Amino acid sequence: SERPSDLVVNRLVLFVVKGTATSTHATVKPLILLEELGVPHDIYVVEKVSAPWFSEINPHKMVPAILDRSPDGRDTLRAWESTSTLMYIADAYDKDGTFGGRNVQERSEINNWLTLHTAALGPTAKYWLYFYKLHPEKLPKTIEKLRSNITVQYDILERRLNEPGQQYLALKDRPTIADIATLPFAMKSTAELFGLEFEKWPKLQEWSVRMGEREAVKRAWQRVAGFGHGEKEYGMLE
């Protein structure tokens, strides 16, 4: 399938959709890491994720997705699924393992808390949102069970951040891709959407505020909301 004429890969291209309250919780993740590391990148606002050309990039037909030049320039590489976009950026650009982890010990914990989000909170939150808003029929027993599972996940994150000196989910000293992956689903605005009082997880709330005060995180949230609302609506932004 032929790509749009304005889609060229001279650097990392992050594929997003038009910014809304419900369209940015996955796409913000790679953008945060790009902002943290100062990686050169373009933004491509996808009008239709069902477009055949886009399914050749991401067969799951969702944002975020990435096209980038391989380090030696011989291939065009792709990343899709938000956790995979974080892994790719860390692999290609986080030379020092500042967010990816510097040694086997660091990476063992990072991958525990990253995968916990990827396998448990992420999909539980997505299934809650699907059955709450998108499913033609309302299934209240299923929705209540998923909401219950979210409280159990918040309990695990709270327990972790109550451990001595544990300022971040994976490492004590600094945020990692585990923290970036978790933040959008573990912050006050998301908790209130789920019908939960975030104050009931005080160390988790403190952690979300600490993450939120980072300049890269602030820039990421601002830009993801703005995409498609500038001079250009769809395609490669300038």
Next chain:
Amino acid sequence: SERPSDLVVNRLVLFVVKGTATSTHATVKPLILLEELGVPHDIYVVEKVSAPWFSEINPHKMVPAILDRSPDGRDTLRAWESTSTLMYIADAYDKDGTFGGRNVQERSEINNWLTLHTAALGPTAKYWLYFYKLHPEKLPKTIEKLRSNITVQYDILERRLNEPGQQYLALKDRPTIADIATLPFAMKSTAELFGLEFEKWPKLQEWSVRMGEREAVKRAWQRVAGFGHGEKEYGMLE
């Protein structure tokens, strides 16, 4: 709350439960990679994953979990979530990147197909099992939707394995942790459990048979079934 007398970490310890048709699809994943690489390891059969001592290893209170010595051997580290156990074993023992990926290109695709399983088919299959067997009330409309979501994931895997020369999910040439992660939820026995005709996905069925023929995969399936049915029911196996 205290660690069991027979729990010692002299090498990698893989935490499993009593072998049944529905208790092994996560624990078999790290066991396949341990068998592929020939990693020295112990097996610990957990009686109750709700036990406070086990929650200090895995706060999510599930198998698989790993305790291992750090590279220098001065400290102990942990992995939990099946995808995290695969990422750890590859990091600590797959120095050639045979299963973990040798460069940024290989790892980009490995991470795409690994994360697709971790985020999509994995949690969808686990939620299907939960509502099908474990939930006190039977919710058939929920079960049906999850089954439908499995067929969508099978469709994505089928498309991939229909691409020219694409013998495995991530790499054309050899299987990776992406293939190992996918196999337990994408084979005839599991498809039949979900009430699906696996023959509807011919290239996926062929792929599952190719993976199943690997000696390491055969050893893993044979061993994981037997855990807890030997002379020692629970605790560290000999």
